Structure 1
Amino acid sequence: MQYKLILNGKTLKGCTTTEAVDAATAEKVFKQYANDNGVDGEWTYDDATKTFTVTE
C-alpha cells in the first residue's frame, strides 16, 4: 500500500511517498530518504493515514 512521509526539516519541507508491503519496510525507505537529504530528527507514525513525519 501507499505510505507517505511529511518532512519537517529545519532546511527541508515537503511531502513524499513510497510503495511498501508494510510500514516497517516503508520506514527504512523514508529513513534513507531524509538521510539522503540531510534531514534527521523526531519520527512519528500514524497507521491510520499511513503517514510518517520527521521533525528536525
Structure 2
Amino acid sequence: TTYKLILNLKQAKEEAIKEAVDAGTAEKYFKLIANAKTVEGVWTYKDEIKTFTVTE
C-alpha cells in the first residue's frame, strides 16, 4: 500500500509519499519528513487512497 502527504506551510507546498505494507510505517515515516520539513499544521487524513495532510 502507498500513502501520500500534503504539506502546506506559510509559503510552500510539498508532497510526501512512501510505499509500505501498513500505515504505522507510513505515519512514522511521514512524521519524520513532515517534522523535518515543517513544525506546524493541521494533521488530517483522506479516506480512499490512504493519505494524510498538515495545513498550517
Segments of 4+ moved more than 4 angstroms: none
Task: Within 5 Å, give how 1:24-43 maps onto structure 2.
Answer: 24-43=24-43
Contact 1:9 1:39 (C-alpha < 8 Å) held by counterparts: no
Contact 1:4 1:18 (C-alpha < 8 Å) held by counterparts: yes
Structure 2: 5+ residue stretches without partners: none
Corresponding position of 1:3: 3
Normalising by structure 2, report the TM-score: 0.77
Structure 1: 5+ residue stretches without partners: none
Identity of aligned residues (%): 61
